[PDB]
Amino acid sequence: SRYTHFLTLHYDAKPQGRDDRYCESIMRRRGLTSPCKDINTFIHGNKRSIKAICENKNGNPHRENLRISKSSFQVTTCKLHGGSPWPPCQYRATAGFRNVVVACENGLPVHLDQSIFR
């Protein structure tokens, strides 16, 4: 549930064109439009590497109670443009490639630290 929800806001396997229109589309169908999110990042690629971040293989402790991946991930950060909190929600996209900071529960990712993408 909490895991399954992490995927909803933060996982997108095989995206097409990670541009502005990509954010506005997926932000809508992931239900982050009304009222919209200021900022939100999607990890791409194979699911199993993201879970693995809660094991010793692809993860380290991070700060007080977080975890940060060994490997890097393709990523798409979607940032709100236009101030107003309700749709239509405008987004600028920024693609990148780096490790991720997450929280874990029962060996499964249940939280993304957006601060690293701020």
Side-chain angles (χ1 to χ4, degrees):
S1 176
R2 202 99 64 185
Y3 174 55
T4 273
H5 183 72
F6 165 81
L7 298 176
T8 295
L9 332 168
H10 297 312
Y11 173 65
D12 187 28
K14 302 146 54 190
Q16 213 19 238
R18 294 143 66 187
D19 63 328
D20 292 356
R21 291 221 256 42
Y22 161 83
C23 285
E24 289 150 6
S25 193
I26 192 171
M27 289 299 282
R28 245 170 287 170
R29 40 178 186 91
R30 290 308 174 91
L32 313 177
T33 44
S34 129
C36 328
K37 265 83 272 297
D38 64 320
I39 196 168
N40 182 85
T41 303
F42 297 91
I43 315 160
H44 308 303
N46 266 124
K47 196 176 297 164
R48 71 174 170 278
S49 303
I50 314 177
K51 311 201 272 298
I53 310 170
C54 302
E55 314 161 26
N56 250 191
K57 157 191 170 185
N58 191 23
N60 281 166
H62 188 63
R63 288 176 151 183
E64 287 92 53
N65 46 28
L66 303 168
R67 274 200 130 253
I68 184 171
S69 58
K70 312 307 199 316
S71 56
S72 318
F73 296 86
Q74 293 291 345
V75 135
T76 296
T77 305
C78 298
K79 296 193 186 191
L80 188 70
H81 208 68
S84 161
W86 308 89
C89 314
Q90 261 195 150
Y91 292 104
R92 287 216 166 110
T94 282
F97 184 60
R98 63 117 63 216
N99 49 347
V100 284
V101 183
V102 310
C104 287
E105 186 166 327
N106 304 321
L108 296 165
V110 292
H111 170 84
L112 198 87
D113 189 346
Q114 290 282 166
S115 83
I116 78 169
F117 306 109
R118 221 52 63 93

